């Protein structure tokens, strides 16, 4: 048992964090007041769910989570929602004035006024740990706080916790539900500055989750509720191995070993199946081979791209529910050859498999139907360079005219930081191209 601390920054990270922790409580059997009847060891324990929940003397299970935002509106919804009594009151930290969708306001001017308090409160959660292994950080790419404060936080975390792992859940901006025109600028600025301080980052493309909601769930105009319900279901599948017994990705270090061959290319792609509307409650159950096959279909990816284009450097299959091991090996065998799936010449052309024999949990009020078996594939493919090529293009268009740049310079930032960030990006795209495509 080694503890993980989850940090949620800005509206995007906070709202998605609220949905995840709700789901965490349902999968583990924790009541919104924090009571876990099925926990015979009151006041403490070495169980696998204790990596995410601490315990009080009175039998309260409190998430090891911290919520930070530069305005209080979104966090106020967390202090008055259902699970208001679950979180530490002092782990919900809010400012007064937000970063105005401005990376510089979140990193230099505004963010600078709360970064010390954020660290102290984090440091309080760490002192309660007997073997902290690292942090999970939820933030948006396009918000001023999600980008600017988060880069600043990551920098501070490498100083005070140099040996601990830092994983990322990042929201990739999509125009169908965007907020700011400068979101490409903030995306590039935070990537470049967080790149050397992040061990592994799972990007969530709002456009991918949006389309999935419209096609599979027949939702005409998906909102942030619908989007986050599905993200929380996928996040749950990535962090399940850390919260349950298992033999694949049991600790944060193992995320890097299996998915990140080289430090800079730490952007694995996540694919999940099946997604079925709760209106089809009597659906026919998909087979282990059916859901497995769907993990190589671009339409189910958490980031829009075409893995047919690139090469695979690592693949992990995390199954949940009624899944017989021999049925997975048979599914792999055929799909290995029945499709143009190309690994790099320098990697063991294999698949890692872990099975959790409990079906996924669904939350009351959600858009998904219950399923007997599901799978989340985590893969590192050079095809996710396509996502970067889309960001960098939108960046280049505006920066060529220097559009919106004065807003950044007037808030402590220096104009040279734009160019070196864009070069760093240009290098990242050639990192994937030197691997193959």
């Amino acid at each position: 048992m080694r503890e993980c601390i989850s940090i949620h920054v800005g509206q995007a990270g906070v709202q998605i964090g609220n949905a995840c922790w709700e789901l965490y409580c349902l999968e583990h059997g924790i009541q919104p007041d924090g009571q876990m009847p099925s926990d015979k060891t009151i006041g403490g324990g070495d169980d696998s769910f204790n990596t995410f929940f601490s315990e009080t003397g009175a039998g309260k299970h409190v998430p090891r989570a911290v919520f930070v935002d530069l305005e209080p509106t979104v966090i106020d919804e967390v202090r008055t929602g259902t699970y208001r009594q679950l979180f530490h009151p002092e782990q919900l930290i809010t400012g007064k004035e937000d970063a105005a969708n401005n990376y510089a306001r979140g990193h230099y001017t505004i963010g600078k006024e709360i970064i010390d308090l954020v660290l102290d409160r984090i440091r309080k959660l760490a002192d309660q740990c007997t073997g902290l292994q690292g942090f999970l950080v939820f933030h948006s790419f396009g918000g001023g706080t999600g980008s600017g404060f988060t880069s600043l936080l990551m920098e501070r975390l490498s100083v005070d916790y140099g040996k601990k792992s830092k994983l990322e859940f990042s929201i990739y901006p999509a125009p169908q539900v965007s907020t700011a025109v400068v979101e490409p600028y903030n995306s590039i600025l935070t990537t470049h500055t967080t790149l050397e301080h992040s061990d592994c980052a799972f990007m969530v493309d709002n456009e991918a989750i949006y389309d999935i909601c419209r096609r599979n769930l027949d939702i005409e105009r998906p909102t942030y509720t619908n989007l986050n319900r599905l993200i929380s279901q996928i996040v749950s599948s990535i962090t399940a191995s850390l919260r349950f017994d298992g033999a694949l990705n049991v600790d944060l270090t193992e995320f890097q070993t299996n998915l990140v061959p080289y430090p800079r290319i730490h952007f694995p792609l996540a694919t999940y199946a099946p997604v079925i509307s709760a209106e089809k409650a009597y659906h026919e159950q998909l087979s282990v081979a059916e859901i497995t096959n769907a993990c190589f279909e671009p339409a189910n990816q958490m980031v829009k791209c075409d893995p047919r284009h690139g090469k695979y450097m690592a693949c992990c299959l995390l199954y949940r529910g009624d899944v017989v091991p021999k049925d997975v090996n048979a599914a792999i065998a055929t799909i290995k050859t029945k499709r143009s799936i190309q690994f790099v010449d320098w990697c063991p052309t294999g698949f890692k498999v872990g099975i959790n024999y409990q079906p996924p949990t669904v939350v009351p009020g959600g858009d998904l139907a219950k399923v007997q078996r599901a799978v989340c594939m985590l893969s590192n493919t050079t095809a996710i360079a396509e996502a970067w090529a889309r960001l960098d293009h939108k960046f280049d268009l505006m920066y060529a005219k220097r559009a919106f740049v004065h807003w950044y310079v007037g808030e402590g930032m220096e104009e040279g930081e734009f160019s070196e960030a864009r070069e760093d990006m240009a290098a990242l795209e050639k990192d994937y191209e030197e691997v193959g495509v």
């Binding site: 305005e71 007064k96 004035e97 937000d98 105005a100 969708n101 401005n102 125009p175 965007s178 700011a180 025109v181 400068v182 490409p184 005409e220 105009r221 939108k394 268009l397 505006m398 060529a400 005219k401 559009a403 919106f404 004065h406 807003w407």
Partner: protein
């Protein structure tokens, strides 16, 4: 970002500022005395943005009234909402300005600026989360233009990080044939280019053409023009006064609408056009981008859109708004700058304005606005070349170089709009 401080200067500033409080207060269910007679809890969400709670479950508008002419005191005071304002928020002089930008900015109005800052500090000190300021005035007169810009500069010195927002009415000979107004307008534009973050250009030439040629008003009156104004000030401020997705943040609007600091002059538009006693989503969207529905006398088809905001109001299909909006951008892609991706922002609001069930407000940063500035610059140049009435201004201390520097500063502004209208990403 919450409280905003309203300031109205001069006859036009108070004349359109008063109507603003009459319109929005009716939307928030605030009777003339200040009591909330509304039947919806949404009418009180973002109420503190424009009002104060002064006990008794009442709301005193956070407004400051100024004018060198004491006559404006009676007009506003004797209005249907003249008593809901603070008696302490009345700063009025004994001497007018007489269409002299100099008297308002250098002599008369200057002596009256310190007192105005007093009532401004009184309001800000009592603000729990002050975000910025908004000033209504004309640019042709002497008080609102000459003194209003001086007060803008003073406030910005004390509140340098707050947002300064202005509703500036542009002079037109169609409504007031005074030959010294191009002077005042040009001298003011010189100030507004430096010391404000967002400026709504409300053009008397466009207001007159809408009433005369569209509203069928052979002899339009300041009441007819102000009706179109009041409705526009309510639409552009809808998201600051009611819940919705377009957050409620003057600074996030300025971050997304102003790509270059000097290009912060917005062309408003409103649809449908209505009179004073007197259509689906496709019409609203289409009509919004029609030259006849613009509050500034310029044809958007003559230039390119840098950024655009659209505020829809009323019960309406939300997916239908995303479809039709997406359509006009494609059919009119030649009129948007390609080097600013996703430069169009949309949002709906539930509560529409009185008399209407579904409206739309258009706020555009468009290079075609240079036409408005070309008009004023021509008239300024005609008068300056003859030195007509320059002694009215130099007699108050101004140096002749202020006219030239002001005239050069505006020609540069025009050159700047033209530069990004022909700028291509391919």
């Amino acid at each position: 970002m919450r409280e905003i401080v309203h300031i109205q200067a001069g006859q036009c500033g108070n004349q359109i500022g008063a109507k603003f409080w009459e319109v929005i207060s009716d939307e928030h269910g605030i009777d003339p005395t200040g009591s909330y007679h509304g039947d919806s809890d949404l009418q009180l969400e973002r109420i503190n943005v424009y009002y104060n709670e002064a006990t008794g479950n009442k709301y005193v508008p956070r407004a400051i009234l100024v004018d060198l002419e004491p006559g404006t005191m009676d007009s506003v005071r004797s209005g249907p909402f003249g008593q809901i304002f603070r008696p302490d928020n009345f700063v009025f002089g004994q001497s007018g300005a007489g269409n002299n930008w100099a008297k308002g900015h250098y002599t008369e109005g200057a002596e009256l600026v310190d007192s105005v800052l007093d009532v401004v500090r009184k309001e800000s000190e009592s603000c729990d989360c002050l975000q910025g300021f908004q000033l209504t005035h004309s640019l042709g007169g002497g008080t609102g233009s000459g003194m209003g810009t001086l007060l803008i500069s003073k406030i910005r010195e004390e509140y340098p990080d707050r947002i300064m927002n202005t509703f500036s009415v542009m002079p037109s000979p169609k409504v007031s044939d005074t030959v010294v107004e191009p002077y005042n307008a040009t001298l003011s534009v010189h100030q507004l280019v430096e010391n404000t973050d967002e400026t709504y250009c409300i053009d008397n030439e466009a207001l007159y053409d809408i009433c005369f040629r569209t509203l069928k008003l052979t002899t339009p009156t300041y009441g007819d023009l102000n009706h179109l104004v009041s409705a526009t000030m309510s639409g552009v401020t809808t998201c600051l006064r009611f819940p919705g997705q377009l957050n409620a943040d003057l600074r996030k609007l300025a971050v997304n609408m102003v790509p270059f600091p000097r290009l912060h002059f917005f062309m408003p538009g409103f649809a449908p056009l209505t009179s004073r006693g007197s259509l689906t989503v496709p019409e609203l969207t289409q009509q919004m981008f029609d030259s006849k529905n613009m509050m500034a006398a310029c044809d958007p088809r003559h230039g390119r859109y840098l950024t655009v905001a659209a505020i829809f109001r009323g019960r309406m299909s939300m997916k239908e708004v995303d479809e039709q909006m997406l359509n006009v951008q494609n059919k009119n892609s030649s009129y948007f700058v390609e080097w600013i991706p996703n430069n169009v922002k949309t949002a709906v609001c539930d509560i529409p304005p009185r008399g209407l069930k579904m409206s739309a407000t258009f706020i555009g940063n468009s290079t075609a606005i240079q036409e408005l500035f070309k008009r004023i610059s021509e008239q300024f140049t005609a008068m300056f070349r003859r030195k007509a009435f320059l002694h009215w201004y130099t007699g108050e201390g101004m140096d002749e170089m202020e006219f030239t520097e002001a005239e050069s500063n505006m020609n540069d502004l025009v050159s700047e709009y033209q530069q990004y209208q022909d700028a291509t990403a391919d």
